[PDB]
């Protein structure tokens, strides 16, 4: 800050914050902040009177938040909850003084993915983040977007201190699969949009956060219909045939080995091909889906979605397809 | 009687009644009653004006009631109906004169299990049975509770008239199974409670019989959750792992051979292990369960049970779990 704004400031601040992210920061201001600040002494910066801050401390305190240098999926109901607590502080800042402070204070003792994930969503949705452009995920946390080989090649570059660029590969045994329409899935661009798309309109949004995203519902319907078409075309251009729809009662015919690795975490598990779906402990039962899919499918077939009271809310009308997306994603 | 009560009377009467039960009685009063009485000549003893008596005679008459010396399960919709007709006579007696009469008259030409079963429930629920303690099932009809070997050993004792006690065994090839947590299932005590529990609050009760059992519903929820925990603990103490929940789409992995025999009836059938469930003629289809289980499971999931009119009766409240038990057992 300029005990405020700029943007080539706001901006600077951000680049510092997501610089070497798997290691304590090297930018000194970020550290005395990191040390000196107390998110709890002038609940005023906070439009909540700092209930959000006060909740994260509580957890950082009982030290019940996920550890640093460990992995993180946004599909973990707790990891998510923790990542999203950071979003609610950064969210209720009146100005840069409260953001930098917090993403500095926190950056330094909350885990990286919760952190990477909170800083981005926050920058994207909060009032205070206008001027900024976020660096591309692919360069901030490259392990999610580069291969496993280039990663190891880069680890060696570093061991030996001799530089240089390595050329990446493509997945399976090209000329042996349908890792022929790979160029599409594996692109750092689509992978970027896919993540952004869902940071722009998150599945977890409540309108307490501030405004309402408009038709995420159709927006969900549509974005995916697009990747599914866009995908189906590439498979056309490759003498391949449109894709199979998946069912829970059948084998997952087509499995792959991703060859990708986590930074802290191990390599991504692989899937053998012609496998039978198993009931996965913790998440949900396979049949649990099969019934979900029917409750779904009956709302489409009935003409109405029925809520909690047994109210039937009609969907044979234009808002239709969006109440369906709210129930389906 | 004392042309009534006592209890060391009521009581006596009962012990006479369930004495050698697979054979006509040897206590003379029980027999001239047995012969001389007519449940139909002083409809007055009866608070029904003897519609109950009058219904059993009707059936004993067309001789359409189950035969004597034959088996009986309480799961047979007719056997049950016949056993429960005895309960409704014994039920509407104004005094001992009507009970002894009937369980004497009947004891002697209705089948034993319908009889054993009616005398007990009747003694347990009817107004007139206060003073009594019932003998333990295990000694009145030992075939349901002792092994097949001890039974045959006792048959020999008898053939030869040389007495004595035999030591019973435990089931499969102990040190070969999970007939290691046998001591629990096979105990004459738990087996006694299990039967009593369901005689105290029967699945067939209507409140016409006289009063309402209070929360059989939660009472059902709970009693079984208890045997299931109590069981799960014993399997802990045996290096065994908590039990598998059963599904209709899977094999019944764990089968057993009971080695038990009926008195009149043959030995209990056995089950081979890793078998596939078959649709059993007469009872119901396997899928018939699979849908039942979903109708169930949707009431839980919806928030309401829906009756016959399509009334939704809410269950997200404290009486909750008991309307669920009324629909589930
Ligand atoms: C990776 O593919 C690139 C294409 O960008 C190759 O880099 C080339 O290096 C060759 C040496 O044979 C030069 O003739 C080209 O001018 C290079 N281009 C940049 C059109 O560097 C590279 O050879 C591949 N392999 C490494 C086996 O980097
Ligand atoms: C059944 O087990 C009992 C344990 O109650 C055994 O009865 C015992 O008989 C032995 C003879 O070896 C005596 O030493 C014990 O005093 C008995 N106890 C009653 C502690 O009788 C019996 O041996 C077993 N078998 C029959 C192979 O009855
Ligand atoms: Cu039971």
């Amino acid at each position: 800050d300029a005990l405020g704004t700029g943007n080539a400031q706001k901006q600077q601040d951000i680049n510092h914050l997501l610089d070497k992210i798997y290691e304590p920061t090297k930018y000194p201001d970020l550290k005395d902040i990191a040390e000196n600040f107390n998110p709890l002494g002038d609940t005023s910066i906070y439009n909540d009177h700092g209930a959000a801050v006060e909740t994260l401390m509580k957890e950082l305190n009982d030290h019940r938040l996920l550890e640093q240098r460990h992995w993180y999926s946004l599909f973990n109901t707790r990891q998510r909850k923790e990542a999203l607590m950071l979003f609610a502080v950064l969210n209720q800042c009146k100005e840069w003084y409260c953001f930098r402070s917090n993403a500095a204070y926190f950056r330094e003792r909350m885990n990286e993915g919760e952190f990477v994930y909170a800083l981005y969503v926050s920058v994207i949705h909060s009032k205070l983040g206008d001027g900024i452009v976020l660096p591309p995920l692919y360069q901030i946390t490259p392990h999610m977007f580069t291969n496993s080989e280039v990663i190891d090649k880069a680890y060696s570059a570093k061991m030996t201190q001799k530089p240089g660029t390595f050329n990446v590969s493509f997945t399976g045994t090209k000329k042996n699969r349908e890792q022929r329409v790979a160029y599409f899935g594996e692109d750092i661009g689509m992978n970027i949009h896919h993540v952004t798309w869902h940071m722009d309109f998150p599945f977890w949004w409540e309108d307490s956060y501030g405004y309402h995203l408009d038709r995420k519902g159709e927006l969900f319907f549509w974005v995916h219909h697009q990747l599914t078409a866009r995908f189906d075309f590439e498979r056309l251009s490759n003498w391949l045939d449109p894709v199979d729809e998946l069912h829970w009662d059948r084998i997952i015919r087509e499995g792959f080995a991703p060859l990708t690795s986590y930074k802290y975490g191990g390599e991504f598990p692989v899937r053998p091909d012609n496998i039978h779906f198993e009931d996965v402990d913790g998440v949900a039962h396979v049949h649990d889906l099969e019934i979900t899919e029917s409750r779904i499918h009956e709302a489409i077939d009935h003409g109405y979605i029925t809520d909690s009271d047994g109210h039937t809310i009609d969907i044979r009308q234009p808002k239709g397809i969006e109440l369906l997306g709210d129930i389906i994603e």
Side-chain angles (χ1 to χ4, degrees), chain A residues 116-239:
Chain A
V116 171
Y117 182 94
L119 175 78
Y120 273 59
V121 146
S122 295
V123 147
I124 306 189
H125 297 284
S126 164
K127 355 252 152 261
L128 263 132
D130 266 295
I132 322 158
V133 168
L134 288 177
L137 264 152
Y138 59 77
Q139 39 196 234
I140 280 331
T141 71
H143 282 270
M144 297 319 218
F145 312 55
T146 303
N147 223 46
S148 222
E149 183 217 37
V150 162
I151 251 328
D152 276 9
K153 309 228 253 105
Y155 294 155
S156 248
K158 207 15 162 287
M159 321 201 223
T160 80
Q161 303 250 273
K162 158 196 173 256
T165 104
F166 329 88
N167 281 346
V168 309
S169 37
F170 279 159
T171 302
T173 301
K174 210 300 160 197
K175 15 244 216 134
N176 246 150
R177 323 183 51 188
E178 53 165 67
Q179 292 245 227
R180 144 127 137 202
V181 90
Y183 64 85
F184 174 96
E186 258 176 51
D187 170 297
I188 67 143
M190 286 267 188
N191 298 165
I192 287 307
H193 156 73
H194 197 204
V195 345
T196 321
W197 190 94
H198 276 284
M199 232 166 220
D200 269 26
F201 318 84
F203 72 71
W204 49 256
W205 180 266
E206 298 194 68
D207 307 69
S208 310
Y209 308 126
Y211 53 83
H212 154 109
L213 273 48
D214 222 16
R215 247 162 90 200
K216 339 186 273 101
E218 287 210 50
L219 250 31
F220 185 100
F221 155 45
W222 198 235
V223 169
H224 295 81
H225 172 237
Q226 262 187 51
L227 285 41
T228 318
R230 311 179 95 87
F231 179 69
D232 268 348
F233 249 125
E234 314 280 335
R235 30 155 71 226
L236 220 55
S237 323
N238 300 265
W239 330 107

